[PDB]
Design a protein around this ligand. Structure first.
Ligand SMILES: CC(C)(COP(=O)(O)OP(=O)(O)OC[C@H]1O[C@@H](n2cnc3c(N)ncnc32)[C@H](O)[C@@H]1OP(=O)(O)O)[C@@H](O)C(=O)NCCC(=O)NCCS
Ligand SMILES: CC(C)(COP(=O)(O)OP(=O)(O)OC[C@H]1O[C@@H](n2cnc3c(N)ncnc32)[C@H](O)[C@@H]1OP(=O)(O)O)[C@@H](O)C(=O)NCCC(=O)NCCS
Ligand SMILES: CC(C)(COP(=O)(O)OP(=O)(O)OC[C@H]1O[C@@H](n2cnc3c(N)ncnc32)[C@H](O)[C@@H]1OP(=O)(O)O)[C@@H](O)C(=O)NCCC(=O)NCCS
Ligand SMILES: CC(C)(COP(=O)(O)OP(=O)(O)OC[C@H]1O[C@@H](n2cnc3c(N)ncnc32)[C@H](O)[C@@H]1OP(=O)(O)O)[C@@H](O)C(=O)NCCC(=O)NCCS
Lengths: 151, 151, 154, 155, 155, 154
C-alpha cells in the first residue's frame, strides 16, 4: 500500500496580517512555525487518512522576513515513511504582491506520526516518489532519520 | 496590458479548528465568508499588484457544512475586469481527510477594486482567459455586472 | 410542537465593536471578510434566540459595501428575524460605522441571511413563527416572500 | 459647561460564549467577562467624550451567576456621572440561555474612564444629563462612590 | 485540615503588549489587563486546589500606570488565604519597558476563586501556609477583606 | 556603545498558560505548531529584555516533542539568554506540561533559538554581552560555542 507524493501535496497562501507581526510589522518566527506545522499536519493527514501528531521538527533557518501584508506561500509533501511515521518537507516563500518580489523564507523537515482514535501510532502507507526532487529527498531521508536518532 | 488568469490563481487549504466552529463543531458561515474574502483579496492583489478593497460579494449558498478538523479548500481566480475592478470567482470544498469524502461547500463571485496608496481606485490590467471554464466565466461576466448594477 | 408565534423583539440583537488592526488591510481599511464574519455572527445570535436551537447559515444574499470603516471606528450591527419558513429564518442585518472622534456615522451595508435551526444531529428542525410588530418589521415581513422566491430560483 | 444626555453614550454589546472562553466544565472565565465589560465601557466613554480614553479603575465585580457555552452575554453601558476629565461608567451584564430563553443578571460594575488628548494627557469631558429615574439615582449617588475611590487608593 | 505552602500555588506569566491590545494611542486596554489577571488567578487557584475553579469576584482594580506596545507585562499570583471552598488570590502586575528596562507597578488586586467538582458544585479546598513576611501579613489581613466582600454584596 | 555585560537574570522569562481548544487537534492533543509558537514567543520576550531592541528569529534548532499536553493542562515555559555574539543571542527554552488536576508534570521539550537584535530599519544591531551566574547558566554558556559551530555549518 503506497501513494504518490502528489496525492498528499498541499499548498497554502496566507496574507500576513498585523496580529501575525511584531510592532515593526515583521512576521513572528513563531507564526511561521505554526503555519509550517499546520501544512505538515494537513499533508500527513492526507497521506495517512488519519489524525497525526508532530513528533519533531528539524532546525529551521529563516533566510528572509515577511512583512504585513505580503503573501506567505507554503508547500508541503511527504518525502519518506516509516512504519507509523512520515517525513514531511515544507518550503515557505514570502511574496510581496505590490512589487512582485518573491523570496525563499525557509525549508525544513518534520516528522509526523499517524495515530488512531485512541492516540496509538497507526501504520501508514508508503510514499512513491515521482519527480527527481522527490526521488532525491526519498533517497536521502534514511540519513536524516539517523541524525534524528543520534540527536 | 493583460495577464492570464493563471498568474493570479490562488489556492488555500485550511484545517478547520475548534475556534472556527460552533458548539456542535460545524464551521461558522462567517468564517467561511472571511476565508473567501481573504483568497479573493490575495487573488486580486496578485493580478493588480496593488492594495485592494472588497466592493461587494454576490449571494453565497452553503451547499454543505464542514466540521472540525476537515480541511477547507479554496481556489480563487480573476474572471473579468473593469477599469479599476476585478471579478473574482471563489470555489470552496470541504475535505474529510480521515474518510476521503470531499464535497462542494460553495461558489461565489466578488468584486474587488484596486486602490493606490491614498485609497483612490487604480487601473488594473486586463485578464486573458485560457481554459474553457475561464472563457465561459469571462463571456458571462458582463451580465453578472449588469445584475449588480440593477441591485 | 408550539402554536404561538414569537415577536421579532424576542431575538433582535445589537452589537458594537471597535475596529482593530487584525480587522484591517495595510492601509487601515477594514476587510470585507471581517464585516461579513460579524454579519454572520449577529445573524447566528439572532436566530439562536428565536429558535432556541443550534443553527447553521444556509445562505447570505448579495452584500454591497457602501463605505469602509477605519481602524479605530466603531462598527454597529443590528439583526432581527424578518420572516420564517418551516425550519428557516430570514435575518436582516444592518451595519454602520461610527467615527467616535468626529461623530460621523455612515451606513456600511445591509444584508439578508437565511439561518436554519438544527437538531443535535445537524438535521433541520422546525422553528417558531415570527410576529412582526413595528411598522418596519411589518414591511420586511410583507416583502420577505418575494425575496424567498429569488432564493428558490438560484 | 457642555452637557449631553446619558443616552448619547449608551452602548449595547452581545457576545456568543464559545469553548475557548470557558473552563473545562463550560463555565465562562471571569476574565472574559471583565474584558467585555471594559470594552463596552471604553466605547461608552468614547461616545460621551469624543476622545480616546483609558481605564483608570474598575470597582469590585461580584459574579451573581455564570454563563456557559452557546449562551449569549448581553452587556449595556452608560455614563452616569463625570468629573473634570473622568467619567463614571455603569455596566450591566446578563446571560441569555440559548435553550430556554431565560435572562439572568451576571454582574454589574462601575468603572472610571479618563478622556485623553493625542499626547495621552487627561482632557476635559462634558457633563452628563440623567433622564430616567435610574439615571438620576445613579447620578445622585456618584459623588459618594467617587469619595470611596479616593479613600481606597490613599496611603 | 490539609494545608500547603503559598509557594505551591505561586504562578508567573509574561505577555507581550501588541497593537490589538491597545487604544489608538498605544496604551493597553484595561480589559486586557483584567483578562490576564483572572487567567493567572485561575491557574494559581487550580494549582492550590487541584480542581476546576470559577471566579466568584474581583475586588477593585486601580491602574497606577499604563503599558504600551512592545512592552511586556509581568504578572504574579498566589493564594493568600482560604475559606471552605474559596481562595483569596493576590495578583501583582508590572510593565517592563522594552527600550529602557524600567519596571513599573501597573496594578495589584485580590480575587475570590471557588473550587468546583465535576458537576460545578463548590468543593472543599486545603488551607494555605504563609511563609514570607509579606504572605503572613496578607494572611493576617484576609479575614477583614472577606468581611468587606460580605458587606458590599449585602442588601 | 556599552562595555558592561548584563546578567542572564535580567532577561530570564517565565510563562504559564492553560491549554485551550484552539491549540488542540480533534483528539484534544496540543498542536506542535502551538508549542512552537509559544517557544518563539518566550524567546522573543527574553531577547527583547536582554537587548532592549526589536528582535527577529534567525533560527530554531531541532525540536523533539517528548510528550504532548492535553486541553486543560498548563503549559509552563522558561527562557533565558545563554550566550551572545555581536548581534545575535542564543536563547534556551524549556517547556513542561502540568496536569493541574492530578499534579503530574512532564517535560515537553527543550530548544535553542537564535535571536538577532534589529534597528528600526530591520538591520542587525549589536547586543550586550551576557554574564552567566548560576552553575546551570555557566554550563550552557560553556557549551554554546560548539552549538554555534553546527549552525555555522548548516
Ligand atoms: C538572520 C538575519 C537577521 C541575518 O542577517 P544578515 O543581513 O545576514 O546579517 P549578519 O550576517 O551580520 O547576521 C546577523 C547575525 O545573525 C546570525 N545568523 C544569521 N543567520 C543565522 C542562522 N540561520 N542561525 C543562527 N544565526 C544566524 C549571524 O551569524 C550574525 O551573528 P553575529 O552578529 O553574532 O555575528 C537575516 O537573514 C534575516 O532577517 N532573516 C530573517 C529573520 C526573520 O525575519 N525571522 C522571522 C520569521 S521569517
Ligand atoms: C442549507 C441546508 C441546511 C439545507 O438542508 P436540507 O437537508 O436540504 O433540508 P431542507 O431542504 O428541508 O432545507 C432546510 C431549509 O433550508 C432552506 N434552504 C436550503 N438551502 C437554502 C439556501 N441556499 N438559501 C435559503 N434557504 C435555503 C430550505 O428552503 C428549507 O427551508 P424551510 O424548512 O423553511 O422550508 C443544508 O444544505 C446545509 O447543512 N448546508 C450547509 C449549511 C452550513 O453548514 N453552513 C455553514 C458554513 S459551510
Ligand atoms: C488614571 C490616570 C490617567 C490619572 O492621570 P493623572 O496624570 O494622575 O492626572 P489626574 O490626577 O488629573 O487624573 C485624571 C482623572 O482621573 C481620576 N483618577 C485617577 N486615578 C483614578 C482611579 N484609580 N480611580 C478613579 N479615578 C481616578 C482623577 O480623579 C481625575 O479625575 P477628574 O479629572 O475628574 O477630577 C493615570 O494614573 C493612568 O494613566 N493610569 C493608567 C491608565 C491605563 O493605562 N489603564 C489601562 C491599563 S494599564
Ligand atoms: C460564586 C458562586 C460559586 C457561589 O456559590 P454558591 O452556590 O452560592 O455556594 P456558597 O455560598 O457555598 O459559595 C462558595 C464560596 O464562594 C464564596 N462567595 C460567593 N460569592 C462571593 C463573592 N461575590 N465574593 C467573594 N466570595 C464569594 C462564599 O463565601 C463561599 O465561601 P466559603 O466556601 O469559603 O465559605 C456562585 O454564585 C457562582 O457560580 N457565581 C458565578 C461564578 C462564575 O461563573 N464566574 C465566572 C464569570 S460569569
Amino acid at each position: 500500500q503506497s501513494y504518490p507524493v502528489e496525492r498528499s501535496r498541499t499548498i497554502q497562501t496566507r496574507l500576513v496580517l498585523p496580529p501575525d507581526t511584531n510592532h515593526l510589522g515583521t512576521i513572528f518566527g513563531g507564526k511561521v512555525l505554526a503555519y509550517i506545522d499546520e501544512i505538515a499536519a494537513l499533508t500527513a493527514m492526507k497521506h495517512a487518512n488519519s489524525a497525526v501528531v508532530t513528533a519533531s521538527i528539524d532546525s529551521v533557518d529563516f533566510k528572509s522576513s515577511a512583512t504585513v501584508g505580503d503573501a506567505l506561500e507554503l508547500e508541503g509533501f511527504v518525502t519518506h515513511t516509516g512504519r507509523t511515521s512520515m517525513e514531511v518537507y515544507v518550503r515557505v516563500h514570502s511574496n510581496n504582491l505590490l512589487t512582485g518580489e518573491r523570496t525563499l523564507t525557509t525549508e525544513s523537515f518534520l516528522t509526523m506520526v499517524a495515530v488512531d482514535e485512541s492516540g496509538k501510532p497507526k501504520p501508514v502507507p508508503q510514499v512513491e516518489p515521482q519527480t527527481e526532487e522527490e526521488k532525491r529527498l526519498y533517497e536521502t531521508a534514511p540519513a536524516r532519520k539517523e541524525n534524528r536518532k543520534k540527536r
